[PDB]
Design an enzyme around this catalytic site. Structure first.
Site, PDB file in Angstrom:
ATOM      1  N   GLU K  57      -2.985  -2.535  -3.453  1.00 31.84           N
ATOM      2  CA  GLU K  57      -3.665  -1.294  -3.094  1.00 31.84           C
ATOM      3  C   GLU K  57      -2.871  -0.585  -2.007  1.00 31.84           C
ATOM      4  OE1 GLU K  57      -7.869  -1.538  -1.987  1.00 31.84           O
ATOM      5  OE2 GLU K  57      -8.059   0.085  -3.452  1.00 31.84           O
ATOM      6  N   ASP K  58      -1.906   0.229  -2.427  1.00 26.79           N
ATOM      7  CA  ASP K  58      -1.060   0.986  -1.508  1.00 26.79           C
ATOM      8  C   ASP K  58      -0.355   0.066  -0.520  1.00 26.79           C
ATOM      9  OD1 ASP K  58      -2.063   3.082  -2.895  1.00 26.79           O
ATOM     10  OD2 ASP K  58      -2.936   4.123  -1.174  1.00 26.79           O
ATOM     11  N   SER K  59       0.068  -1.093  -0.996  1.00 25.99           N
ATOM     12  CA  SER K  59       0.844  -2.028  -0.206  1.00 25.99           C
ATOM     13  C   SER K  59       2.171  -2.258  -0.911  1.00 25.99           C
ATOM     14  CB  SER K  59       0.090  -3.343  -0.018  1.00 25.99           C
ATOM     15  OG  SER K  59       0.680  -4.120   1.002  1.00 25.99           O
ATOM     16  N   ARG K 227      -2.542   9.834  -8.385  1.00 24.33           N
ATOM     17  CA  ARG K 227      -1.887  10.773  -7.491  1.00 24.33           C
ATOM     18  C   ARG K 227      -0.880  11.668  -8.197  1.00 24.33           C
ATOM     19  NH1 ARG K 227      -1.158   6.695  -2.260  1.00 24.33           N
ATOM     20  NH2 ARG K 227      -3.310   5.937  -2.414  1.00 24.33           N
TER      21      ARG K 227
END
Ligand SMILES: [Mg+2]
Ligand SMILES: [Zn+2]
Ligand SMILES: [Zn+2]
Ligand SMILES: [Zn+2]
Lengths: 49, 240, 115, 67, 52, 49, 258, 96, 46, 49, 329, 34, 48
Positions: K57-59, K227
């Site tokens: 997650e966005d890592s 996104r």
RNA sequence: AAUUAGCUCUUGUGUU
């Protein structure tokens, strides 16, 4: 005498006006520095338009 | 003026009575860790070594606390203060005389936080009841809070610079209250809309959809590799 | 600040044992070997060799956490064959294979170096 | 600021090929030919020289603080 | 204590060859802040040798 | 093509952007006048037949 | 219930890289050999730096980091040195370290290129790779700038730090024709043939083999210059065998007590 | 998408097919200039690309006019977030 | 006893006693830099 | 700031080639602080005599 | 590198990279921004795959060996200022090493680190709660000396002594500290794909191509669809073409001479799949991965929000004076 | 003569000339000078 | 845990290839866009 | 064991 007006860097009345890259490098000034700011009490200030 | 001192926000009523600053708190960046149970949080060594939990000396646990006091405040799994029953306190950062290191039954020892301690874990835009849940502490090498991804939904956490707050309950009554009311497994179903708040997210969900398709076949080696990861497995290999 | 030293991955300390055996209680003839300060390099080869043996009903390994340096190997064998015997035989077979490969590599390099 | 000693990805020594690369570029070689003439096959090494700016040359223009 | 503030060197163990400064010490061990790393460790005095 | 040729050899003889303005080829338009003007985004795409 | 008999075939051997093929072995053993190539092959690199005087435009830790990455020719000393953690000595003795000294001063106006040839080893068998093309650039110096330092290089493998990594590139690959379907191409005709493809130009992949296992692993091990590539492979095999034997000894002492 | 992990049908449609009409305050791009959205158009133009319709997909890239229009469409989201947070905070506090 | 500095411009070391004006014997400059310590500094090349 | 008005924060059509349509603070002052385009110039002023 | 002459300026909070890199794919506009002269970021071999679950997650997953080889390693300067001034007739501060028998209020702080000038020397290792400038004011004297900020642990880079406007002694001390990209640090692409390092794997553990190419950064696929940063994908694709062909790519916003089709056709001429996919082998088991992985060089940056500058904890610290509640900050 | 399709090069030559004549902070310097 | 370990074998990614149409869908999309443009032109003509 | 105000900048919440 009236008082002192600060000068924004690289203006026509700044010492770094018309100096070449070698001239600035001899002065420990980055030639890529845009100028465009004042130095008040050793801090670099800029006026947001 | 006196009116300004207590008028609105930052005044006495809202800035010092309804909400105050508290001790035994921590705040760091969160990073994922899929190897932790959903009720665990991983804290770095320094944060655990800085915060203490006070424990009452008893004959059951006097030897362990004696050893902890022996270790001092330098090594991690040690203590920081030792409090006599008459209110007097002795600081373990000043290497006092060993007569002071002797402890008896009615004393308290402020030991460093270790594995299994209960903490309240919170994210600042606290909206609902699932933003302040209780976790069990696990000590981990690097310097970030680590939490299982299933709980990233109640917190609305993101792992992209998010910071979260940790509060350490200081008493047995408070710890029992947290364990019996606000542990993560007890908050799976919310009373807001009688539906779960924690689910399967991201690539785990993608891979479970790709994993239960009709044409997915596994040989014995990979089946054994997967079965190595079931905690609840009974040890019997299913008939292929 | 909280960075562990690098040598933590492969150096044992006081009171730390390289390998520990525990008898799994769920099923007969199963054991858990807990190897400290090792990683997939040994786990994978030992698992594969144990899978070669036709008297091993189950052979798997796992690393509980990438930040803690140890592995667990679970081995279940048929009766009258203790899993410890399977483990040690697998190790001997790896040693034999590695020595044979080393000598054959030496011979092939010697041949290549002289046309 | 200065050429890295090793490629970040594979570890190949790329720290001794900056001067040769500049010389080959000055000798009327295309950058691709200059890179492959130095024995840089994998593009991981190629980016180390192709996308490097040598900033220490400008830093040397300043007079030393001590002499 | 005499050892506090003395430039010390580790003589044995996985930290052999590192220099540091003793911040706090006891009769059994000592705390060494390392010059090369941003971390303070604990080492027994028997592996420690004063420098200068 | 004359302007682009003279400007390609700039920083050598004398010729610069100010001379480009002087020949009446480019022009400073402000946002108030920009109402009455009608722009072409690109010459070849939006001026052919 | 026993081991198989692998075979080896070198197709190329230079002073920089070796290409070979291993046959009749499990994928696990081949991959472990690769990972031992990268990680656990003892080698010598600089690991202790003391700077007596630095006035260059790089801070001291920058210079130390650059020095650590310089490859040192360590072909026969690595077998003779002891790990600094194992040597029963106080301060680095010649049996567990190698001493280098550097002392550069730029007096003339033209800039000085402080390179790898400025490192003066105290042992003739351990030198940077300039034994016999420019040098590993370390620093550039102006007039009036000097750099004096002394360093110790010791033995370690890649599992600690990448400066002890001997290899530059390990090109492991098996089953060039996707006959095992271990990878599934959505459109096989868009994928170029492998270097080791024994397949005609017409078809895109070999037909599926239901009963098949990975065999014939291809390696192309390219060295960074410290150890010769065949020496890399031999040391890796020896190290893997030593690890397994030590594990066996420990297991024996544990089994005899349980 | 079908797994529900991330994304939706509109994201795929915009990436592949077409970005679509931009809107501010629920309407097409208003006439900021006198009777035209941008100086590049003629006065009183109600055609699709004149009033803020993006006919390209994110793969093909947006032409400059529709790039500016898409920036206008995107700005309102940030503005709405910045106002909605403070608007709902007081609602929730009073409810509590 | 005296402490050694280095001048900003002339780059000539001068001994300046404590409780003295910060000035250089030549060039009358006002910026002085302290000199490097003498105790040993050890960096691991990691 | 802290104003319920949303018209000043929006991206007006007149900011084409004058003010960057993408650079703006994300904080409480979104749309109120802006940046010039690359070729934007600001008139310095002259006498109309 | 924020300015070329950063070694002269005594700024507060200066960050500077070791090896800033010119972008492999650039816009023609940035030529006039002097970005190629003072770049900020590195081209890194980025692979978009869900490897272990530590980048979900966005890592991101960082290559440990690359970090060891100086990848995104940076250095942080911090400057302190202090001047001695005439407080009054009876109060007068002065730089001087405190003595254990003349100053009344004195803690267990170590004053032998700084020399008899009352100033630390360059090259001296310092850490938190260590005095740097020895300043005392007469009452017989009370301590007023400055300290290094808690949890900094740097090395004194340089010390400068001069006079202010009114002719009093005045010192500025710049302390440097090397930051290694540990987990928890923040990285961002050039299309708003920010994230924090989740874990670091060595070169042996990371997946690899047919050759020995292993990613420096692995990002999760799920960051892409919601996104719709297709520019990230196109830049990654053209990075391969720029690296193999040997020339800086062009990404001018409105070009129409560059589209995905031509880039793919160029890429397929260098022996790669035309869409930029590659066959990666699992790092741990050596087995192939059934899904071909998108991989290529992309420009990344290291944001200044390092985790070590944010970690904080408290247990019965200082207190406020008005309301005896724990302080702020 | 007209410049057909050899325009990107001309389009960027003119912009490079502009940015050589006037920097990036020209408005501030000009305003203060005036 | 189980699914994350099987993903090591199965893998997952996303790239440019996942955003391309088969060059026959592009024709359909262009035709639909042209139809819509003609329709709105016609409506504006009727208002004219 | 040595202070408070004010101003500015910045981070996370911008999911659809
Ligand atoms: Mg977030
Ligand atoms: Zn490389
Ligand atoms: Zn020795
Ligand atoms: Zn002087």
């Amino acid at each position: 005498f009236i008082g002192k007006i600060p000068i924004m860097l690289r203006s026509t009345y700044c010492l770094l006006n018309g100096l070449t890259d070698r001239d600035l490098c001899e002065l420990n000034e980055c030639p890529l520095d845009p100028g465009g700011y004042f130095i008040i009490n050793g801090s670099e200030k800029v006026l947001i338009a | 003026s006196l009116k300004q001192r207590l008028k609105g926000k930052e005044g006495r009523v809202r800035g010092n009575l309804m909400g105050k600053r508290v001790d035994f708190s921590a705040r760091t960046v969160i990073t994922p860790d899929p190897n932790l149970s959903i009720d665990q949080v991983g804290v770095p060594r320094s944060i655990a070594a800085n915060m203490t939990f006070a424990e009452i000396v008893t004959p059951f646990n006097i030897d362990r606390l004696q050893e902890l006091v022996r270790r001092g405040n330098s090594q991690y799994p040690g203590a920081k203060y030792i409090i006599r029953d008459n209110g007097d306190r002795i600081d373990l950062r000043f290497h006092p005389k060993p007569s002071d290191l002797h402890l008896q039954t009615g004393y308290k020892v402020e030991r460093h936080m270790c594995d299994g301690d209960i903490v309240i874990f919170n994210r600042q835009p606290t909206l609902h009841k699932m933003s302040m849940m209780g976790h069990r502490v696990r000590i981990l090498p690097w310097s970030t809070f680590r939490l299982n991804l299933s709980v990233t939904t109640p917190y609305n956490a993101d792992f992209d610079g998010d910071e979260m707050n940790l509060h350490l309950p200081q008493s047995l009554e408070t710890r029992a209250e947290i364990q019996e009311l606000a542990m993560v497994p007890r908050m799976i179903v919310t009373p807001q809309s009688n539906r779960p708040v924690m689910g399967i997210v991201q690539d785990t969900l993608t891979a479970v959809r790709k994993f239960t398709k009709r044409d997915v076949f596994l040989e014995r080696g990979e089946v054994m590799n997967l079965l190595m990861f079931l905690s609840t497995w009974d040890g019997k290999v299913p008939q292929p | 600040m909280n960075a562990p030293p690098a040598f933590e991955s492969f150096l044992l300390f006081e009171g730390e044992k390289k390998i520990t055996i525990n008898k799994d209680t769920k099923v007969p003839n199963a054991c858990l070997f807990t190897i400290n300060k090792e990683d997939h390099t040994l786990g994978n080869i030992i698992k594969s060799q144990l899978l070669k043996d036709p008297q091993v009903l189950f052979a798997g390994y796992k690393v509980p956490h990438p930040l803690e340096h140890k592995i667990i190997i679970r081995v279940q064998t048929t009766p009258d064959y203790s899993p410890q015997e399977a483990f040690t035989n697998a190790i001997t077979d790896l040693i034999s294979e590695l020595s044979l490969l080393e000598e054959r590599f030496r011979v092939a390099i010697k041949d290549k170096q002289e046309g | 600021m200065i050429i890295p000693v090793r490629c970040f990805t594979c570890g190949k020594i790329v720290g001794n090929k900056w001067e040769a690369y500049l010389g080959l570029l000055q000798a009327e070689y295309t950058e691709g030919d200059a890179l492959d003439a130095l024995g840089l096959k994998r593009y991981c090494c190629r980016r180390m020289l192709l996308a490097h700016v040598d900033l220490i040359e400008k830093l040397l223009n300043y007079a030393p603080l001590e002499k | 204590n005499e050892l506090i503030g003395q430039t010390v060197r580790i003589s044995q163990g996985p930290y052999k060859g590192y220099i540091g400064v003793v911040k706090d010490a006891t009769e059994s061990t000592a705390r060494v802040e390392l010059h090369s790393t941003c971390q303070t460790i604990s080492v027994d005095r028997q592996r420690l040798t004063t420098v200068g | 093509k004359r302007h682009i040729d003279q400007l390609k050899e700039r920083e050598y003889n004398n010729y610069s952007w100010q001379d480009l303005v002087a020949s009446g080829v480019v022009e400073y338009i402000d946002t108030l006048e920009e109402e009455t003007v009608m722009l072409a985004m690109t010459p070849d795409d939006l001026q052919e037949k | 219930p026993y081991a198989n008999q692998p075979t080896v075939r070198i197709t190329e051997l230079t002073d920089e890289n070796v290409k070979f093929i291993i046959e009749n072995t499990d994928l696990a053993v081949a991959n472990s050999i690769r990972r031992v190539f990268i990680a656990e092959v003892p080698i010598i690199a600089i690991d202790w730096v003391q700077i007596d005087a630095n006035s260059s435009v790089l801070h001291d830790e920058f210079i130390a980091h650059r020095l650590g990455l310089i490859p040192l020719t360590s072909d026969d000393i690595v077998d003779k040195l002891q790990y600094s953690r194992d040597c029963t000595c106080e301060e680095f003795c010649p049996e567990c370290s190698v001493e280098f000294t550097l002392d550069v001063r730029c007096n003339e106006d033209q800039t000085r290129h402080v390179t790898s040839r400025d490192l003066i080893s105290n042992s003739p068998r351990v030198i940077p790779v300039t034994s016999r093309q420019d040098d590993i650039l370390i620093v550039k110096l102006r007039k009036g700038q000097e750099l004096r330092l002394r360093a110790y290089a010791k033995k370690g493998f890649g599992k600690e730090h990448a400066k002890w990594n001997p290899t530059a590139g390990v090109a492991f690959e098996y089953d060039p024709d996707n006959a095992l379907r271990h990878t599934v191409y959505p459109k096989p005709e868009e994928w170029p043939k492998s270097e080791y493809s024994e397949l005609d130009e017409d078809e895109s992949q070999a037909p599926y083999d239901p009963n098949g296992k990975p065999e014939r692993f291809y390696y192309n091990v390219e060295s960074c210059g410290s150890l010769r590539p065949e020496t890399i492979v031999l040391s890796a095999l020896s190290g893997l065998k030593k690890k397994l034997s030590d594990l066996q000894t420990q297991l024996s002492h544990e089994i005899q007590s349980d | 998408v079908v797994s529900g992990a991330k994304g939706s049908k509109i994201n795929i449609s915009q990436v592949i097919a077409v970005v679509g009409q931009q809107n501010v305050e629920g309407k097409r791009i208003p006439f900021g200039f006198k009777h035209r959205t941008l100086p590049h158009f003629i006065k009183d133009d109600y055609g699709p690309e004149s009033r803020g319709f993006v006919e390209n997909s994110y793969l093909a890239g947006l032409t400059p006019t529709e790039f500016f229009f898409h920036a206008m469409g995107g700005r309102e989201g940030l503005i709405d977030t910045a106002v909605k947070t403070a608007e709902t905070g007081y609602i929730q506090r009073r409810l509590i | 006893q005296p402490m050694i500095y280095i001048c900003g411009e002339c780059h000539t070391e001068n001994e300046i006693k404590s409780r003295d004006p910060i000035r250089c014997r030549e060039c009358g400059y006002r910026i002085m830099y302290k000199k490097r310590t003498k105790r040993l500094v050890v960096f691991d090349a990691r | 700031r802290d104003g319920k008005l949303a018209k000043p924060r929006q991206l007006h059509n007149t900011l084409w080639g004058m003010v960057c349509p993408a650079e703006t603070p994300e904080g409480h002052a979104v749309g109120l602080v802006k940046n010039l385009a690359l070729m934007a110039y600001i008139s310095v002023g002259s006498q109309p005599s | 590198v924020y300015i070329t002459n950063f070694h002269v300026r005594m700024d507060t909070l200066a960050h500077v990279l070791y090896y800033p890199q010119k972008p492999l794919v650039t816009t023609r506009s940035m030529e006039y921004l002097r970005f190629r002269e003072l770049p900020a970021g590195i081209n890194s071999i980025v692979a978009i795959a869900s490897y272990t679950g530590y980048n979900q997650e966005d890592s991101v997953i960082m290559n440990r060996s690359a970090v060891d080889r100086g990848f995104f390693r940076s250095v942080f300067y911090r400057s302190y200022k202090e001047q001695e001034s005439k407080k009054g007739f009876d109060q007068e501060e002065v730089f001087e090493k405190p003595t254990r028998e003349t100053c009344q209020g004195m803690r267990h702080a170590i004053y032998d680190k700084l020399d008899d000038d009352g100033l630390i020397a360059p090259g001296v290792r310092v850490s938190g709660d260590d005095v740097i400038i020895g300043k005392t004011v007469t009452l017989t004297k009370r301590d007023c000396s400055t300290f290094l900020r808690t949890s900094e642990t740097g090395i004194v880079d340089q010390v400068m002594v001069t006079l202010n406007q009114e002719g009093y002694k005045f010192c500025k001390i710049r302390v440097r500290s090397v930051r290694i990209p540990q987990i928890g640090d923040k990285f961002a692409s050039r299309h708003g794909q920010k994230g924090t390092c989740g874990i670091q794997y060595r070169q042996e553990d990371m997946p690899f191509t047919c050759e020995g190419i292993t990613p420096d950064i692995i990002i999760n696929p799920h960051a892409i669809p919601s996104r719709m940063t297709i520019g990230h994908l196109i830049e990654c694709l053209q990075g391969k073409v720029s690296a193999n062909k040997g020339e800086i790519g062009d990404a001018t916003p409105f070009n129409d001479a560059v589209n995905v089709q031509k880039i793919s056709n160029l890429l397929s001429d260098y022996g790669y799949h035309l869409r930029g996919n590659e066959v990666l082998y699992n790092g741990f088991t050596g087995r192939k991965i059934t899904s071909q992985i998108f991989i290529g060089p992309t420009y990344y940056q290291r944001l200044k929000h390092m985790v070590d500058d944010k970690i904080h904890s408290r247990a019965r610290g200082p207190i406020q004076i008005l309301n005896r509640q724990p302080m702020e900050g | 003569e007209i410049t057909p399709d050899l325009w990107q090069e001309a389009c960027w030559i003119v912009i490079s000339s502009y940015f050589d004549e006037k920097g990036l902070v020209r408005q501030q310097l000009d305003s203060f000078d005036e | 845990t189980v699914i994350n370990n099987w993903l090591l074998i199965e893998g997952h990614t996303i790239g440019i290839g996942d955003s391309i149409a088969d060059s026959k869908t592009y024709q359909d999309i262009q035709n639909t866009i042209k139809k819509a443009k003609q329709d709105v032109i016609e409506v504006i003509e009727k208002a004219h």
